[PDB]
Structure 1
């Protein structure tokens, strides 16, 4: 699948942060009105300290059937630094993206989108490159303040940056910690919550797209 190479990936931490502060201006927090048909999930595993494996899974909604799966193993040199996940995993994901045949209506990533220090988490960043609605679903908080939602089944609260709502915290499963949902590109807080709620089945904490992707990332890491 095609995408737009907006800049170089091999950059020192300081120049990468500048690239984020510039790219954040291109983000469009538009509503996603309607029922998607093709939903993609993306996950990464690391077979070695410098070898990652990116997996992209495309599911049919609302049946949740698997329509396509592609992957790419490659050298990963950029160190993990909070706030710069895109410069570590972005390149390999795009490499897998190049192989994808189905054009997703929305892509869900592991990690933040809008709920990022410079308003541009991996989900937002990748959204600008692929020019398709994106959502960031994180298992932990990177930025923003919030009031822990109660332990219900769909109980939730907004994630804030002072006064601005940058996403939401959702208790997708009772007995499990909530997940952090923020819009990426061509998406908004309200739509991301609706969609993620719709992508997560009862008994599950993680939405099917990224949940299935993570499984394949682990399976392929062996056989």
Structure 2
């Protein structure tokens, strides 16, 4: 399974920041229309001090049947720097990506995308490489400002950077904290909202793709 190596990974943090900027102009915040056939959930986890693990699961929509599950381990060499996290986890995910048999229609990551100091969260960065619509879903806020939406199923608020809408905050499950949805590449706020709603069972808290990938990560 293919991808486009837009740049090298072994960069100094200063250079990494410069790339992010270059890539952000390549981002296309474009409506996703209709429903995907296949969605992928991604879970990037770190068993060791410098050991990463990438698990990808490809569900079929609307059934959420698990068609495929791939995983790779890699050395995590790049230092942990908030806003530069993709340089740590990007490489390893790509190893897992290359092992996929089924081509996903939309990919959901555990992170953000547009909601990023430089509008290049994990979902955005990888969207550029894998060249398919992506979304970032986070169980906790990473970037941006919001008003807590009410404690009522499916309530929601916009997420902001200053005055610009950078994603949304959804109360997916009553009496639980909300999730944080930000578009990646070939994705806008509005479409990402709709899709993530479409990927969540009522009324669980976490979208199936990411719930399931975590479950598989756990299974290891």
The TM-score with structure 2 as length reference comes to: 0.98
In the TM superposition, residue 44 of structure 1 has moved relative to its aligned partner by 1.6
What is the number of residues matched between the two proteins?
220
Contact 1:114 1:120 in 2 (8 A): yes
Task: Provide Cα deviations, 1:99-153, integer angstroms capped at 9, x if missing partner.
Answer: 0011110000000110001011010000000000000001122221111100111
* Off by >3 Å, runs of 4+ in structure 1: none
1:139/1:178 contact within 8 Å kept:
yes
The one-character-per-residue Cα deviations of 1:159-179 (angstroms, maximum 9, x if unpaired) are 111221110000111111111
Instruction: State the Cα distance separating 1:11 from its structure 2 match.
Output: 1.3
Unaligned runs of 5+ in 2: none
Question: Is residue 84 of structure 2 the alignment partner of residue 71 of structure 1?
Answer: no
Deviations 1:172-193 (A, max 9, x none): 1111111110100000000000
Distance in 1 between the 2:177 and 2:11 partners? Answer: 35
In structure 2, what is the equivalent of residue 14 of structure 1?
A: 14
Would you say the 8 A contact 1:82–1:142 is kept in 2?
no
Whole-Å separation in 1 of the counterparts to 2:134 and 2:15: 24
Q: CA deviation at 1:47?
A: 2.1
Which moved further from structure 2: 118-127 or 77-86?
Answer: 77-86
Deviates more, 1:22-31 or 1:12-21: 12-21
CA RMSD of aligned residues (A): 0.9
Q: TM-score, normalised by structure 1?
A: 0.96
Confirm or deny: 8 A CA contact 1:148 1:157 kept in the other structure: yes
C-alpha contact (below 8 Å) 1:171/1:177 kept by paired residues: yes
Q: Check the 8 A contact 1:114/1:183 in 2, yes or no.
A: yes
Structure 1, unaligned stretches of length 5 or more? none
Rounded to whole Å, the distance in 1 between the matches of 2:84 and 2:204 is: 28
- Separation in 1, partners of 2:66, 2:19: 35
Contact 1:58 1:104 in 2 (8 A): yes
- Structure 1 range deviating more: 202-211 or 29-38: 202-211
Q: Report if the CA contact (8 A) 2:153-2:203 is conserved.
A: no
